Amino acid sequence: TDITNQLTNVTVGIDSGTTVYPHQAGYVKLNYGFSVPNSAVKGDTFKITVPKELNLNGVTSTAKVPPIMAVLANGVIDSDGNVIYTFTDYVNTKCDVKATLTMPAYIDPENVKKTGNVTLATGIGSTTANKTVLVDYEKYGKFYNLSIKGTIDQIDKTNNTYRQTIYVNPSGDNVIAPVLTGNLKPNTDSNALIDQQNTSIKVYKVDNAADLSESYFVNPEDVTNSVNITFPNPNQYKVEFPDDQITTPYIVVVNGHIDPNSKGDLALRSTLYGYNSNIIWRSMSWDNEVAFNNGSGSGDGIDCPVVP
Amino acid sequence: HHLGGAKQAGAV
């Protein structure tokens, strides 16, 4: 049975700052507390509502919700993105059961494509919480006529893959003989494996910077074949783009692998090299890093009465 | 030569 509505003493809340910076390791915490009906038995359920503006995975390909520990309940994310918890047999014998739960949640890149005010709401049954925050994706990086910014997604730790989206020349500058390299970030013990058999790169031409996401969600003019992609040094890729200039942005999507025996995390550096109109050679670098977070849940009950 | 960065959060 679904016992969502028979939950009592329900409280809900959202913990975050007033501005969230999804590209500076910002996230939010969804908090919940409730009493469970003594009449709860194993296999009973209850549903948390999670809004479209969030997901529970962020940079990671999927997420697990915290089992609530006393196991009091096991959770899964449904196809709407809401969370269903199933009660264990713990409720079969325990009374005055109570529980609290926290889940980190992340600004969903596809539903929040631009910087602006977002009102976030979650809840359990009729008990809801809401918060309105500014989602600030901030700015791409720039140095003379060299702009660049990149973001990671879909870190899959089952399959050891990652994906990285880079905007080259998001600022629409003229670059003469532009070159991009993709590297590990020094001294991180980075777990990226960047080579011919671990790394596949695609590159897209952009007509109008305006068609680009601030969130870096990308819906993939493919110009992969018109460019020269090479693996010139250990754990480094290089992308070489008729007149030796570019005047538009480019999207570079990298489908790579990680090393699960590596002692560090996914930590990446991408560099754009190019001349300006004065024929000076410069470079602009962009680091990409990650931070992982977990939620937790716990409950308590007492022995139900026994007639004496 | 110059340098910026992003960091992103995600589920364990």
From B12, which residue of chain A is nearest by alpha-carbon distance?
Answer: A292
How far is it, in rounded angstroms, from Cα A10 to Cα A99? 10
Q: Are residues A18 and A126 in the same domain?
A: yes
Q: What is the CATH number of the domain that holds A224?
A: 2.60.40.1290
Assess if residue A163 is contained within a domain: yes
Assess if residue A86 is contained within a domain: yes
CA distances from A212 to A16, A27, A227, A259, A305 (A): 27, 23, 21, 31, 63
Scanning B1-12 for CB atoms below 8 A from A yields 1-12
In DSSP terms, which residues pair with A155 in a beta bridge?
A60
Q: Write the residue in A284, A288, A292 that is nearest to B11 by C-beta.
A: A292
Q: Are residues A160 and A266 in the same domain?
A: yes
Q: Are A143 and A28 in contact (CB under 8 A)?
A: no
Phi/psi at A93 (5° precision): -115, -10
Q: Are residues A159 and A191 in the same domain?
A: yes
> Helix (H, G, I), strand (E, B), or coil: what is residue A137?
coil
How far is it, in rounded angstroms, from Cα A98 to Cα A165? 44
Q: What is the CA radius of gyration of chain B?
A: 12
Q: Are residues A263 and A171 in the same domain?
A: yes
Q: Are residues A133 and A144 in the same domain?
A: no
Chain A residues near any Cβ of chain B (below 8 Å): 22-27, 56-60, 62-64, 104, 106, 141, 143, 149-152, 155, 282-294
From A150, which residue of chain B is nearest by alpha-carbon distance?
Answer: B6
Q: What is the CATH number of the domain that holds A128?
A: 2.60.40.1280
Q: What are the residues whose beta carbons fall under 8 Å from the beta carbon of A192, sequence distance 6 or more?
A: A162, A184, A235, A256, A257, A258, A259, A266, A267, A268
Q: Are residues A168 and A230 in the same domain?
A: yes
Q: Find, among A270, A116, A264, the residue nearest to A190 by Cα.
A: A264
From A110, A137, A164, give the residue that closes a domain: A137
How far is it, in rounded angstroms, from Cα A276 to Cα A145? 6
CA distances from A66 to A169, A231, A250, A298, A306 (A): 41, 41, 40, 9, 32
Q: Are residues A173 and A38 in the same domain?
A: no
How far is it, in rounded angstroms, from Cα A130 to Cα A257? 38
Q: Are residues A90 and A132 in the same domain?
A: yes
Instruction: Answer whether A141 sits within 8 Å of B4, measured CB to CB.
Output: yes
Gaps (C–N > 2.5 Å) in chain B: which residues precede them? none
What was the resolution (in A) of this experimentally determined structure? 2.0
Range of the domain at A178: 138-290
Q: Are residues A101 and A170 in the same domain?
A: no
